[PDB]
Amino acid sequence: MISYDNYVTILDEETLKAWIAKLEKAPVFAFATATDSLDNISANLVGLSFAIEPGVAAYIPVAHDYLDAPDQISRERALELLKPLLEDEKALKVGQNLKYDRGILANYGIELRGIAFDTMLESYILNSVAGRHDMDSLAERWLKHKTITFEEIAGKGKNQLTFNQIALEEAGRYAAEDADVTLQLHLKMWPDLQKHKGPLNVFENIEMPLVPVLSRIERNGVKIDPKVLHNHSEELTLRLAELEKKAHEIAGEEFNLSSTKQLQTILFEKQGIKPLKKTPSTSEEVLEELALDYPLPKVILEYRGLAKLKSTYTDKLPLMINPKTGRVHTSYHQAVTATGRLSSTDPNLQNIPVRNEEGRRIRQAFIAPEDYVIVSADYSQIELRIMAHLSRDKGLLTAFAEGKDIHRATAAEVFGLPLETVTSEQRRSAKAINFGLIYGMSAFGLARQLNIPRKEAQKYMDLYFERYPGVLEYMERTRAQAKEQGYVETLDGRRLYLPDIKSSNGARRAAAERAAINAPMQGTAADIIKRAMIAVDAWLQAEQPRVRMIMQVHDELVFEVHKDDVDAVAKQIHQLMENCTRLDVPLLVEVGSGENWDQAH
């Protein structure tokens, strides 16, 4: 166990300056801020920890204020002495999720530079699916060392202490150990990270630079109108009441809108085919099947849809408004997805209905501040463009090249008719095929998504591959090397290890092969999106225009732009995104603006 003998507690300036001096000449050093809250914008710095060498670490408490806390260097004094080191881009720091720490220092007007290594990201890039990338997991997996957990020194549940309440020495064991271990983790992973140029390229030029940019995005937050959401909520309550009646009115008596219990004894008991509908879900939905004619399942279907939306966004969002900023600050997770795409939580921006009227009403709540407008810059069907590239298909590429709708272009080729005549059903069919390929779906699954018989769908796929051969090759070639080397790469070098690529298991291995085909396109989209964020943020930081990047969701970047700078800014954002990222994939950036996110979306 870690005792009080392992690390020093710095309580005097002289000792701090001595450490600063050593830190200044160290090649790299681990750094971490201790605070009184997870909420970055409102958190107060409570202490700082540093590790200069394995086994050599210190904790500097500055704002522990429990009853009779011993004297500590003051926060302002510690920070003024540390500021130079922290803002020196030449002083390289190592840390665990430095995005957090960068933000905390930003509450004090300090701009952390030299953000060179993040062990969370080192781990993530080495093998995204190896397991969780939190430090407790990393310490165990890479060093067979069990770190003191936050719950171990602070407690659990509502009665969990905030770090400033923890005794100086106990706080030190926890924080200094974290610093020491972070440096050790770095010393083990960094050498590994260079066994391959692809992962190294992604780590160095994409993930690390993105660290401060995500901090800025999160800290900027988004402006949401609580009234709009509340009115939406009141309304949904009403509609839910109306819908519950129309359900009672279509049938007899009352009942819960829970199928396989009350519904099955209604819907089919009043004729229909016995199978219900799993809310398994996005492949088998008999409720909406019947919905095309049977009125009850259609209302049950919408009832649930609004119920989920209301309790997830309409009633939640307003409560996420931060009292200190009056804005909402989503949590971006940079090391969680298997493919490399950023994920978002509280709120989860990506689960807000795109093609739905209610989803749009939610986005109407994301408003621009006075004299500003919301600007949306989206990469039009980037993953389809990436496949065209990865497939080297002159046909798909040409379609994009002449600005034609690729779904109608594809239909014209598969069904063999003039582009102008392609019907909605045919476009819908080519669309299902195209997106089916990205997820590497089978002819049978496609049949289930287009409601056509098996082999009929296979008939369509054979025609597709015949008209677009380069796609089948890519797929065969990608499933191939996947088994050859156990992983697939993105254009930049990002890797997705596929352990079950030879699982001798049924589904599990089928899943691995699908991931093999998809990852390279979805992963390349992610690298492209991150590189865009980095390029735009660099311009923002350098030119200092009147714009804030406020969100990243799916394939779009969202901003607040001063109403009088819109055109010059829209132009610049547009050029940076489709011309200052990768030059090999045919990219198209759609830019829109409006008073709210829906207007610009």
Add this chain to the structure above:
DNA sequence: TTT
């Protein structure tokens, strides 16, 4: 992910 961080405190």
